Amino acid sequence: EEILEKLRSIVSVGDPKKKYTRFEKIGQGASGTVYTAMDVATGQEVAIKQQPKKELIINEILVMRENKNPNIVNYLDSYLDELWVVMEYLAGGSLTDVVTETCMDEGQIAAVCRECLQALEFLHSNQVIHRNIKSDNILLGMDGSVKLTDFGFCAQITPEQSKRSTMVGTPYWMAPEVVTRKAYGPKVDIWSLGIMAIEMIEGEPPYLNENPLRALYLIATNGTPELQNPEKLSAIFRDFLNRCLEMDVEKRGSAKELLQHQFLKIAKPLSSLTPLIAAAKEATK
Ligand SMILES: C[C@H](Nc1nccc(Nc2cc(C3CC3)[nH]n2)n1)c1ccc2[nH]ccc2n1
């Protein structure tokens, strides 16, 4: 199997057990097994993750290695039947706990959006479509840092073929043009950011109480989802939302132009996120 040796060609040699010490488990679910650890020489804390389809793996590592960014969970090293991937450790945990257990004000939401847009602006400029933007794939630093991960469903595009048409991602966060198997581009990430902002407002994406297929159909025949309580939001927030969740892909904002939106100007410092992190940690204890 050529692929299996293409993977072994990527990862480096050396013994993992010898470079890091004090390993402690913190994750084991629909992925593999995630542990925490520390660098012996510098004292840096790291996160180390440990069939089916070993291609998502290859592209993950490859795409992560050549797309380093302050707003992306940094890939560090890799070792080898289960792969050992060493990554930047963010102690604040996932955005999901924050959106489901806490109320976020517009300044806090704007700050997260801005950090995410900056990640997206970087990826889209390097011809990378994430395709799986959701609060679950946003990690938080104990200092308030906001970073993106999960490049297992991404698509590297080119001027010759700048569109995809496959149904990938997570249903509730998928743009209509992805759901309808049309020719789509990087702006699908923008749609998904918009749905994530709806998470930050309401606690969950639209249609979450429905089954994934019903949600797929609902997205297909509703287009732009409605807020339960639009009146709660400022006019500038609602406008930012409308341009993320625009049906017309041409009218929908890019990461670049959305970064200039007046809504992001009311963003709080990322330190305003640490009380949300503490609340989420308390809430899920
Ligand atoms: C299983 C893990 N749970 C966790 N709990 C406390 C803190 C924490 N921080 C981390 C995780 C990492 C690298 C494994 C992505 N860096 N920092 N992660 C986790 C949580 C959410 C996720 N979204 C997409 C991957 C992923 N993984």
Is 67's C-beta closer than 6 angstroms to any atom of ligand 1? Answer: no
Atom of ligand 1 nearest to the CA of 89: 17
Hey, whose CA ends up nearest to atom 8 of ligand 1?
A: 93
Is 93's C-beta closer than 6 angstroms to any atom of ligand 1? Answer: yes
Cis-peptide into 52, omega within 30 deg:
yes
C-alpha 246 to ligand 1 mean position (Å): 31
Is 96's C-beta closer than 6 angstroms to any atom of ligand 1? Answer: no
CATH number of 90-285: 1.10.510.10
Q: Which of 149, 151, 277, when mutated, tests ligand 1's pocket best, judged by the most ligand atoms within 8 Å of its CB?
A: 149
Is 139's C-beta closer than 6 angstroms to any atom of ligand 1? Answer: yes
3-state secondary structure of 47: strand
Report the length, in residues, of the chain.
Answer: 285
Beta strands at 146-148 and 138-140: parallel, antiparallel or unpaired: antiparallel
Beta strands at 128-129 and 155-156: parallel, antiparallel or unpaired: antiparallel
C-alpha 266 to ligand 1 mean position (Å): 29
Question: Per the structure block, which two tokens stand in for 53?
Answer: 């389809």
**Residues 46, 36 contacting (CB under 8 angstroms):** yes
Q: Whole-angstrom Cα distance, residue 207 to residue 230?
A: 17
- Burial of 46-75, coded b for 16+ CB within 10 Å and e otherwise, reads bbbbeeeeeeebbebbbbbeebeeebbbbb
Q: Whole-angstrom Cα distance, residue 258 to residue 170?
A: 23
Is 137's C-beta closer than 6 angstroms to any atom of ligand 1? Answer: yes
Experimental method: X-ray
CA 263 centroid distance within chain: 21
Fold: same for 1-89 and 90-285: no
C-alpha 70 to ligand 1 mean position (Å): 16
Locus of tokens 């930012």? 240
Is 97's C-beta closer than 6 angstroms to any atom of ligand 1? Answer: no
Hey, whose CA ends up nearest to atom 7 of ligand 1?
A: 93
**Residues 36, 78 contacting (CB under 8 angstroms):** no
Phi-psi category of 72—alpha, beta or left, where left has phi over 0 and alpha has psi -120 to 50?
beta
Identify residue 257 by its one-letter amino acid code.
E
Is 149's C-beta closer than 6 angstroms to any atom of ligand 1? Answer: yes
C-alpha 94 to ligand 1 mean position (Å): 7
C-alpha 210 to ligand 1 mean position (Å): 27
Is 25's C-beta closer than 6 angstroms to any atom of ligand 1? Answer: no
Comparing C-alpha atoms, which of 1, 124, 115, 130 is closest to residue 60? 130
Is 280's C-beta closer than 6 angstroms to any atom of ligand 1? Answer: no
Question: After which residues does the chain break, using C–N > 2.5 Å?
Answer: 50, 80
Q: Whole-angstrom Cα distance, residue 195 to residue 203?
A: 11
Is 73's C-beta closer than 6 angstroms to any atom of ligand 1? Answer: yes
CATH class of 1-89: alpha beta
What secondary structure letter does DSSP report for 205?
Answer: -
C-alpha 137 to ligand 1 mean position (Å): 8
| Spans of all domains in the chain | 1-89, 90-285
Q: Whole-angstrom Cα distance, residue 207 to residue 210?
A: 5
